[PDB]
Amino acid sequence: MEELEQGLLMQPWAWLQLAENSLLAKVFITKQGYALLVSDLQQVWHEQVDTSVVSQRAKELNKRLTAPPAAFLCHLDNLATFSCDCVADALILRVRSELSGLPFYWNFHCMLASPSLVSQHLIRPLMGMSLALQCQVRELATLLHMKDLEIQDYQESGATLIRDRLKTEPFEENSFLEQFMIEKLPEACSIGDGKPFVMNLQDLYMAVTTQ
């Protein structure tokens, strides 16, 4: 199960369409069990489970629909209708799927995640991502400055523009922030339902966690 936790740290986040809201979920599945972390962007919830709990809980939820634990796990790896309740702070996540031509049930018994995993799975990665993204901004801004030194050499000896629509204004970073903060930040920083996060950041998430 230690390897299940290690896989989990380095899994990306998926996005789940409930009827009631959406969730973010990262999951790591093997034949050995699973580990899951879930969030609604206000709270975070954790479960880890081995094959013992799989065959017991599946025999409860699916009374006579028998399998080895690993075949259930294999199907969850495919990943259906999602519903949930917070009962106390069990985010019980109730997952209806179709497997073998039969309706199937799993319930995730997700407790409030520990502050330590919230740090390791979100805050530290998300921080590390913001610093890394800022170094990318810094390297695109050096690259933009380098292309201006190049283009200003043309402007300083002959070299008129032909296509009257290719002009760039000289790149300056403070003013590129100024315009972004008014025109782009409202939309771009919006959390929404977490679909923006899962759509464009998962590569950096995977890289920063593995760093």
Binding site: T66, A71, L102
Partner: protein, 144 residues
């Protein structure tokens, strides 16, 4: 009334072809009589309205849809995607059947059979109906 003979292999008995005969009044759902035989011995039992309901209702499926599964399992109504599995102790006379997908078998139902006391006789009746059913569809063929 309808009946339907279907030829099967028990998991217990790879090389013996068995015959499953089902007999009922158009809805299988109303309950049915069921015979198994191997050309030497025969077994029988019965299933009822509330037993099919309870079997479906524990499995949490619409009755009629579960009856679909029953037709496909018991009346040869299987597609190429459907793989059914048939199990019987003659010793306990416990029948059960399963469907296979996601690389495992899944019980669909179970029967109390009783070994039948007059084996060669219900076999006689069965092969009479089959010889009739050849001749009838053969007569329809010649006409067509």
């Amino acid at each position: 009334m309808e009946r339907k003979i279907s030829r099967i292999h028990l998991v217990s008995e790879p090389s013996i072809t068995h015959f499953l005969q089902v007999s009922w009044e158009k809805t299988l759902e109303s309950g049915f009589v069921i015979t198994l035989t191997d050309g030497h011995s025969a077994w029988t039992g019965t299933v009822s309205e509330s037993e099919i309901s309870q079997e479906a209702d524990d499995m949490a499926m619409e009755k009629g849809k579960y009856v679909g599964e029953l037709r496909k399992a018991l009346l040869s109504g299987a597609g190429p995607a459907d793989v059914y599995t048939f199990n019987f102790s003659k010793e306990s006379c416990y029948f059960f059947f399963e469907k296979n997908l996601k690389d495992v078998s899944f019980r669909l139902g179970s029967f109390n059979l009783e070994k039948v006391e007059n084996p060669a006789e219900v076999i006689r009746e069965l092969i009479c109906y089959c010889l009739d059913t050849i001749a009838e569809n053969q007569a329809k063929n010649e006409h067509l």
